[PDB]
From a paper:
We identified a chimera of the N-terminal domain of [name] (Sso) and the AAA+ domain of PfMCM, Sso-PfMCM with a robust DNA unwinding activity. The N-terminal domain of SsoMCM (residues 1–269, top sequence) was fused to the AAA+ domain of PfMCM (starting at residue 257, bottom sequence) to yield the chimera (middle sequence). The Sso-PfMCM hexamer forms a ring with a channel large enough to accommodate double-stranded DNA (dsDNA) (see ‘Materials and methods’). The two-tiered structure is consistent with electron microscopy studies. The N-terminal tier has three subdomains, A–C with the A-subdomains in a different orientation (see below) than observed previously. The A-subdomains of Sso-PfMCM are rotated 150° compared to those in SsoMCMN. In Sso-PfMCM, the change correlates with a conformer change in P104 at the junction of the A/C-subdomains. The h2i creates a DNA-binding pocket at the MSSB where ssDNA was observed previously. In each subunit of our Sso-PfMCM hexamer crystal structure, residues 198–212 comprise a conserved loop of the OB-fold that projects towards the h2i of the same subunit and the ps1β of an adjacent subunit. The structure reveals a fully conserved glutamine, Q198, of the ACL interacts with the main-chain amide atoms of the h2i. The ATPase active site structurally resembles the ATPase site of the AAA+ helicase E1 (2:04) with Walker-A/B residues of one subunit, and three positively charged residues of the adjacent subunit.
Numbering used by the authors:
A (entry chain A), B (entry chain B): 7 to 269, 1257 to 1361, 1729 to 1904, 1919 to 1965
The structure:
Amino acid sequence: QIDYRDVFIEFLTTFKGNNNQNKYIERINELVAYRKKSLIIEFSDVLSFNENLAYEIINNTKIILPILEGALYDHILQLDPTYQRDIEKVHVRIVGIPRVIELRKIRSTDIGKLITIDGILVKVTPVKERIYKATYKHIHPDCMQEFEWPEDEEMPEVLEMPTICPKCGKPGQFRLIPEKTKLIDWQKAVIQERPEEVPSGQLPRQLEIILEDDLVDSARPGDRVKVTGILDIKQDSPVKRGSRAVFDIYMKVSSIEVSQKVLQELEISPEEEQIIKELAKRKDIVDAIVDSIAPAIYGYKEVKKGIALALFGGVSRKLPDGTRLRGDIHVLLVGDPGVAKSQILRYVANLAPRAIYTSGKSSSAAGLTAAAVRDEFTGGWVLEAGALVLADGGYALIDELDKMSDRDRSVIHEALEQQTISISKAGITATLNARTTVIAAANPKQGRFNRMKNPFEQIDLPPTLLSRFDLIFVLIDEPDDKIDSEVARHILRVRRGESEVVAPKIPHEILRKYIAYARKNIHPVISEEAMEEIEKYYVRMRKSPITARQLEALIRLSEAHARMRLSPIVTREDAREAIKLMEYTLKQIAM
Amino acid sequence: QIDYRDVFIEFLTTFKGNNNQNKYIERINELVAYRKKSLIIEFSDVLSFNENLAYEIINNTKIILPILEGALYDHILQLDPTYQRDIEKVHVRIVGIPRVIELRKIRSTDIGKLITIDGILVKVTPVKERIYKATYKHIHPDCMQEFEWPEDEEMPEVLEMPTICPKCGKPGQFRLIPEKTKLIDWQKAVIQERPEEVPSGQLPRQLEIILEDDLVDSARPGDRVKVTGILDIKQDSPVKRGSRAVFDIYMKVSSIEVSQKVLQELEISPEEEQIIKELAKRKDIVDAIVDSIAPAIYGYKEVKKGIALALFGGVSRKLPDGTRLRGDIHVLLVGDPGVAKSQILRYVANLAPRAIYTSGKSSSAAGLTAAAVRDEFTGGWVLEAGALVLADGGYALIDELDKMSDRDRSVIHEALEQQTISISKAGITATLNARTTVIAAANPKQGRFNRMKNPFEQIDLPPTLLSRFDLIFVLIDEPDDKIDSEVARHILRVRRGESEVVAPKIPHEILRKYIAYARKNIHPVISEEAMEEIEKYYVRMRKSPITARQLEALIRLSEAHARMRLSPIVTREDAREAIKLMEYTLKQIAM
Ligand SMILES: Nc1ncnc2c1ncn2[C@@H]1O[C@H](COP(=O)(O)OP(=O)(O)O)[C@@H](O)[C@H]1O
Ligand SMILES: Nc1ncnc2c1ncn2[C@@H]1O[C@H](COP(=O)(O)OP(=O)(O)O)[C@@H](O)[C@H]1O
Ligand SMILES: [Cl-]
Ligand SMILES: [Cl-]
Ligand SMILES: [Cl-]
Ligand SMILES: [Cl-]
Ligand SMILES: [Cl-]
Ligand SMILES: [Cl-]
Ligand SMILES: [Mg+2]
Ligand SMILES: [Mg+2]
Ligand SMILES: [Zn+2]
Ligand SMILES: [Zn+2]
């Protein structure tokens, strides 16, 4: 950490304008005299005064700005303590700040200007050296003198020689002198689009960037970075023809920092915020939701409640004392073929605000996780995001998880538990966030597993994976004349076109907004009561087989129930509900 | 959306002819004075007045045309309200719209003209920049000046710098000045023939196309597109003779849009249409059709009825509430060695208007589905279409399905259920329509399975696949003296050269025409009576096994039957007949 508060104040009080006037001393004065609450700062001014500050404003905008406003405020109360009786705070507005362009939208209108790109590094060359001023010796018996070539002019990226010795005037052989030539650190790197911004199966576009001097080695392959610089056009075969008058685009980096991915939340309407605030009050809230989850289905009151809790999720707090505590809850539905599994998933996607519906079988290399791929056209490797990476921060409804890739099975455990996926290929080592909630459907290898034989050996999924699902609903279909009829009826109605009173009790769009608010602003805290009940339940159920991992889920489900409750506090009623669901699942395994 | 209605009217009221006259104001006036019902518009005129409209007419002809006609009509009733007592509608005719050429038929007579090709994108280069107008500096101590090069002339594709400085007149070294040079976005892409238009196992031809400025990135690899532009010739190695004076052909794009595949229907002569209604009123129509399916075989009344319903298909309806509903019905014939399966398929192929008879094993990489293949001569990948993709919108009579590729088993579930096949290879990700009805034959792993052993395990196809066939006819051949005798006769007869007595009971040609009509115009609506019968049956058959999948099939078969009725309303008779067959197939399992 460094103090940008003094450079900022120093910049305001000493920067010089077109007429050697203190541009900002005067602007701060008017602001005072007219009781204004914003100071308009030009980016180029700061950039020219102190590059470090300029870039801190670009790379750490959200943290640095509030500090600068505070420093400006204190500075103002110093000029006039009275300002405070009229204004509580000041706003600094930086105009002229480099546009943020998505890598794949770079056009000719951007060449020559200062912009900023977001991406991931996939290649770095070793540090080399560039000549920005040479010294040649005119090997000639009458001459043999030396001189700095590009006179009053930096050498070109292409290397140019002196046709006519400027010391002797006569041509000849020029033998570059290294000892007296000046050098600058150079490094070529390649950055690709952020995996999340690329359509499944598609190759992520790439861009060449040049780091020089102090920027050399600011990052390593596999790093997510924010690069700011000027784009220009180049050619591998310079100043000559070749195939045309077509040029490649590359950036001359000015600043580069490793960054963190920023999920973009959904717009909250204070109108909606209260609307939701209203439903929360409602008493049959918990049940409407479950009943709104997937109407085009008869019953499954419990199964629907599972999905419901999954959508809201648990605490999800990662802290020092005990590192990461995952709040996302995963739900798996194993069942007899034709029991609506593959169906129910698809239905939730239609409710999906931030989801991805996909199956255990993929046609893309990434699949359900991620992977490094080779790009024939560029010859370099790149990272492609599978479903869990694309679904980060959201939901990933996985169907036929039974038929999942070999590559997927390997890294699958990491994504569900660690909530990340690490990739190592070529010189690339990157860790992508897979903070996503999972709801998958699975079938037993041969078909109905209803046979007294255990349910889990019948499914093509290692018991290691199973232990990772907070709730697993073993499903079987036994005909109960009435129920079959019920299902039939339901199906016949759905098949017959429109006119179907199969609408969610609660409103979908309004529910989406419901959940989001629910995951962003509400963070349930464990209750004393819950703690007691669950604890007793745990010993009880174990006295019955169970694992501490189940306990892990228990707490998560409780938190979830409470999040729909938005208390935000857990309550015995909560826990109870949580354990209730959990037991129903266990008696289910008994088939 | 944009409204082309005002631009259109604007074009009519303001366009200017060769003699500054309002060309169209006068054409509209004569149309009025002479009570004409068609306005002739020249494509070139529209194109020169407003490119967006010109291309909307080219890319969205079917939708845009009626709108323009409507707008012209109103413009007309405005000039003369009376025009309406003599004419109801006006037609706009666009003379001069670019011709639509099949990629493989491009010839020298097309170079230089505006045409339109239909294809699928397979490669896209990253966005580059092209100099259309440069700025050059004369590196020379006496000159050192600047100047835009191609004077009054755009820089050519190839880079050409002045031999003699136009400022000083004296030759020397020239240094490009990027900052003062003007750039235009550039992109090279490769388009291939529509998979459907390419013979099995054959490589689809390709074409280089150049996108510039705002056409850059109008699509991605894997996309079906409609490109409009001018073809020209190029040499990868400019101005120098390579191997000969032969040139490649590429297109300079003017317009490119992602398109949808357009199946072309059969032409119903209103005579055939009336004939059709007469046939429909007929008494033994259902049985007529079955007897006409394949007389060259005796019996198999139910099998012939199955095939029959498969051709007419179910409702097939894609809508939001329950997204995609599949109407195509799939039939599978499992049997003993020598029970006539292979023969029957091929016989139904003879009646095939929109079908592809083909075996389970293929010698082509595509096979039954599709696949990305590599082309050695061009070095790029391409998409090839298998039987289900070529048969889209039609039928695919598969024989010996038992013997199918590894790649096939993988993606076939998609084809039968989703009626699509997705492919991901290199930077290509495409989804090809596979809306095709399947009728296959299959043999048991080794032989006769009469054994008490369950039929399906003996045929090499995962139960997952079988569950996708609405009707499966397990066949077995027992002697029963007389019947064998019947077959002998048939075969012996079939050996006579001309016209063995039995043949289509109903006119084949007329039948094809029949089905097509049925499928296009008929859309049977489920019926109350049907609803209850089927429901009561669902519960009944489940009382002794059965699945909801059986339900969605039952409903489709009903619709099909009613479709041959052409009501279009299902009836109690429907379901009844539908379930009748369904039962027969089930009793058949017991072997
Ligand atoms: N309770 C139910 N509510 C609505 N539809 C049901 C229900 N039970 C079964 N179905 C039917 O089951 C069908 C889906 O079966 P499916 O989920 O594809 O089996 P699987 O999961 O093994 O692939 C749907 O078309 C639906 O009509
Ligand atoms: N009902 C039938 N009508 C006409 N021909 C039949 C009939 N049943 C059997 N055949 C004879 O069976 C032969 C075809 O046997 P085939 O279908 O090739 O056995 P598979 O299906 O195992 O390959 C034909 O040449 C045909 O003469
Ligand atoms: Cl921006
Ligand atoms: Cl800008
Ligand atoms: Cl990330
Ligand atoms: Cl045409
Ligand atoms: Cl022409
Ligand atoms: Cl298609
Ligand atoms: Mg399924
Ligand atoms: Mg055969
Ligand atoms: Zn010299
Ligand atoms: Zn000159």
